[PDB]
């Protein structure tokens, strides 16, 4: 449920990818929409073509939540509590979908920072990402 060793390990990678969060947030969704075309069902009001400023504008807030959840890694569920309704209550998002974005999110850090993502970091980050996807899918359980 997130050991002390994973924590001082996830606090660590987010202070190294800090001022790039936002750009990785743009590229993350963009890769998602290309590699998993189905995810576009949810964003029909957007311009989704490679390059969009809505997509840029959106990725800047997805990074937002991530950076934040990392600042409050002891209390991730109060930190993200309004976002759990949007995704589960209102928009009714298939849970399989949280894996896909997170997966895309790792691809991007590995591209721009091959050496932050050691095997072990890959481990801590991977359980942090789908402890974030559990807070956002919480009301289904």
């Amino acid at each position: 449920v997130l050991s002390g060793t994973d924590k001082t390990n996830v606090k660590s990678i987010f202070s190294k990818i800090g001022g790039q969060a936002d750009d990785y947030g743009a590229e993350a969704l963009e890769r998602m929409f290309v590699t998993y075309p189905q995810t576009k069902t949810y964003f029909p009001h957007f311009d989704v073509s490679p390059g969009s400023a809505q997509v840029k504008a959106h990725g800047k807030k997805v990074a937002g939540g991530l950076s934040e959840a990392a600042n409050h890694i002891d209390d991730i569920a109060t930190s993200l509590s309004k976002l759990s309704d949007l995704h589960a209550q209102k928009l009714r998002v298939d849970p399989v979908n949280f894996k896909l974005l997170g997966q895309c999110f790792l691809v991007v850090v590995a591209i721009h920072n091959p050496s932050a993502l050691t095997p072990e970091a890959h481990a801590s980050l991977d359980k942090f990402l789908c402890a974030v996807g559990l807070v956002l899918t919480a009301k289904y359980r």
């Binding site: 590699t35 590995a110 095997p119």
Partner: protein, 146 residues
């Protein structure tokens, strides 16, 4: 699966530059470490149990390389992806009893490997072709689950 002309280019052009011994060992080590339950299948390999144990095991390097070469055979045959994994399917399914969902876990981890290793040349289009393949192969080992 049906493949486009331009899809085979991204796939084939990229295979051309891959170090199988390097990645082979990344792919397998990461699997063992990120999903520690995959460990029980490999007990004949002596100690696993700690990240550094996994890393410094000669079996992990040798096995890893074999796994990747296998994906090789897919790059080669693109149209014939079944029939080429038939005997391998029997082995993973009938003898070992590896649940298919782990074949997906190994595919995803493979993409992270190629991602970190190729940097900016792993364009989004290319990552989409690579997913189509990693999924085709994973599907082609499922086979013997009837």
């Amino acid at each position: 699966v049906h493949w486009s002309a331009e899809e085979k280019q991204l796939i084939t052009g990229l295979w051309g530059k891959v170090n199988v011994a390097e990645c082979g060992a990344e792919a397998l080590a990461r699997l063992l470490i990120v999903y520690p339950w995959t460990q029980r299948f490999f007990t004949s390999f002596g100690n696993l149990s700690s990240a550094s144990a996994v890393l410094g095991n000669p079996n992990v390097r040798a096995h890893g390389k074999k796994v990747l070469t296998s994906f090789g055979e897919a790059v080669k045959n693109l149209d014939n992806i079944k029939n080429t994994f038939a005997q391998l399917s029997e082995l993973h399914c009938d003898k070992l009893h590896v649940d298919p969902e782990n074949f997906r876990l190994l595919g995803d981890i493979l993409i992270i490997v190629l991602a970190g290793h190729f940097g900016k040349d792993f364009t989004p289009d290319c990552q989409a072709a690579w997913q189509k393949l990693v999924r085709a192969v994973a599907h082609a080992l499922a086979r013997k689950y009837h």
